[PDB]
Symmetry: C2
Subunit: 399 residues, 2 copies
């Protein structure tokens, strides 16, 4: 009898991972890593928020058991989540049309959403922006759902091609899922305006799409309430919605895997039937979600003093990002970039496409120890006042 | 007009065990006892955080500088500690680099990841499980498109492991099928194969070309950490290929932190790495990377002499309390004049046993006596205490 594993072929090498290996083996002292996927502060670190440390100290002092949570996790986490998403006093919440499962990260939420849809609905197709978050395709495909792309980003001109977007979505059938990023579109950094969201919501109702809002950066855009505008425009117009949210970034809890999948249906009765099937997809998966990170979030959000500390930390992160964007563009001008990089200031969140070619990206790594990914995506949180000048000088050099 | 996408969804059938739980919570009778629960409880009816766990968490509190993403296979030290627990330190299998471990969200996560990986990367079509087995096995494998078949295991009338029946029913398992075995403390019969039986199963598996999957959730709850790995290791000595889904939920009382692992074993370093590269893909398409807290607690305890000693003692305490309740249950049933013999309870290990009670008797124990058990008649002896034992046993005798 021959082995079951013998004929497996190796997955393709993960290029980003190889790039990290490279950065790891590069002993040059002036390295700048614009390729990372996480927030870094001005010292180049991804620290544990103070509010989180406080919340964790509290849990340590008060926790008396680690016994299984329900399939849907911690109720107060679910409540606080729905409030962040829909606003306090939301008719949708008052009508009890929403249910929320704590999940392992926004990734878990997305996967759980997908399995839930594949097994219980007529959904065949999920539409995502070109480009989008890199793991969307693999998550949705794993559930047996086809992935389609709609027009979004105009690379040459650094713009959201809204007319393109609208026309491309005409191919999306009634009953298809269309996925939108709630804010800080990853990785273009370009979001619809409220008005554009409103057009999008209306069109979705007209065509019969099921909207899925991937909401991983609330507070990194303009602020907590403002970043939910697009979501709430959709929620106001629709009988049904799915929201996959993440606290990985806004709480700096990446590795604790803290997120949620929120179902919204026409009424409480309907969301309950739907939600019972979602709980079954969960049972067939990881059975129940990890407590620590969700408890940390529930602890912060429901305590006025802790919440105020967190909100200020989040503002600090959002503003540090915005000012590295500003600093970046001004420092390129002063170093004689020649080309306009003002689009960086017209974008929000951690990511933008720099517009650099893979040739320029390659030279920047080999020659200047400056690291970006091949598409030219950059994470401006990788910039600091200290590294900005040498970074911009390298960029002018490859231009 | 467009009909809602959720509008016509049929509700999942209600979980009867969750129904019993609400029913219990609402029961005002001060005599009520729940033997249907699924976790460890101490003599005071609590499921506390272990002291070693608290200490480890205080250390993490004081020393953790970041929460940045782990790799897809999680914490390396956790991986190494897992593999030693499974195969023993100095294992030739480890030295040969034939094993790769991914940290996962619980043993459940490990099972699901294993299933998705098999379905996408191999010709495996069927997973065989014991009759009876863990209730969630079927749903997990089915979800990946794998058929689930049962083999003969528990002889319910006589309260034994019908080994001859097991062997013979497995003749139907084809080369390339998965056959799943519980590492120890079979859930929910509490009867495990003897070492000799394990060796027979190992040899048979090799002859038939089955892929063994070891579900290992109770290491430390049977006889001890190393003894409880005997069957797993008997299999590991005979096989080129192997999958183990381990859990730390019960032996570290970290249930809700979701701490487990999926370990692949193949013939050589190269093959295991190719396979493992595909398992990672399965993880990326699911929850992306595993929750750090519980695994980091586990590694912190296991790699520190003094903490590890505090933990092993706590685990021993759990193991011995369970054993004491098994003995006490049998003695008290006798004291209370039970007709039947219940000595099989002493010959079984872990928290779970089938009591032998019918569904009718179980219903009656609830309604009439406030003694809750699950429909199957499975009981959790850790729901028993020196203080609730007598009335509990009188209740059972009265329904026989």
């Amino acid at each position: 009898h021959v082995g079951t594993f013998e004929n497996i072929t190796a997955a393709p090498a993960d290029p980003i991972l190889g790039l990290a290996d490279l950065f790891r083996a590069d002993e040059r002292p002036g390295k700048v890593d614009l390729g990372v996927g996480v927030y870094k502060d001005e010292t180049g670190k991804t620290p544990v928020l103070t509010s989180v440390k406080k919340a964790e100290q509290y849990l340590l002092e008060n926790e008396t058991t680690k016994t299984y949570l329900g399939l849907d996790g911690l109720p107060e986490f679910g409540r606080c989540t729905q409030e962040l998403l829909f606003g306090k006093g939301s008719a949708l919440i008052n009508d009890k049309r929403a249910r929320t499962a704590q999940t392992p990260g926004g990734s878990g939420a997305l996967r759980v959403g997908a399995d839930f849809l594949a097994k219980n609905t007529s959904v065949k197709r999920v539409w995502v922006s070109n480009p989008s978050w890199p793991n969307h395709k693999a998550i949705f495909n794993s559930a047996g759902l086809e992935v389609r792309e709609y027009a979004y980003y105009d690379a040459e001109n650094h713009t959201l091609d809204f007319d393109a977007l609208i026309n491309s979505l005409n191919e999306a059938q009634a009953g298809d899922v269309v996925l939108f990023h709630g804010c800080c579109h990853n990785p273009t950094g370009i979001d619809p305006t409220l008005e554009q969201w409103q057009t999008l919501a209306q069109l979705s109702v007209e065509k019969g799409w099921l909207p899925l809002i991937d909401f991983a950066y609330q507070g990194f855009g303009r602020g907590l309430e403002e970043d939910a505008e697009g979501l709430r425009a959709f929620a106001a117009m629709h009988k049904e919605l799915i929201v996959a949210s993440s606290y990985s970034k806004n709480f700096g809890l990446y590795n604790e895997r803290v997120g949620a999948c929120t179902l919204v249906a026409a009424d409480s009765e309907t969301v309950d039937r739907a939600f019972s099937q979602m709980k079954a997809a969960i049972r067939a998966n990881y059975s129940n979600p990890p407590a620590h990170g969700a408890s940390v979030v529930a602890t912060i959000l429901s305590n006025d003093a802790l919440r105020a500390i967190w909100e200020q930390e989040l503002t600090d992160m959002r503003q540090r990002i915005q000012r590295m964007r500003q600093l970046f563009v001004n420092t390129l001008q002063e170093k004689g970039a020649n080309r306009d990089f003002s689009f960086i200031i017209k974008q929000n969140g951690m990511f933008s496409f720099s517009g650099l070619t893979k040739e320029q990206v390659l030279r920047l790594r080999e020659e200047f120890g400056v690291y970006a990914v091949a598409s030219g995506r950059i994470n401006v949180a990788g910039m600091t006042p200290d590294n900005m000048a040498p970074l911009c000088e390298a960029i002018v050099a490859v231009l």
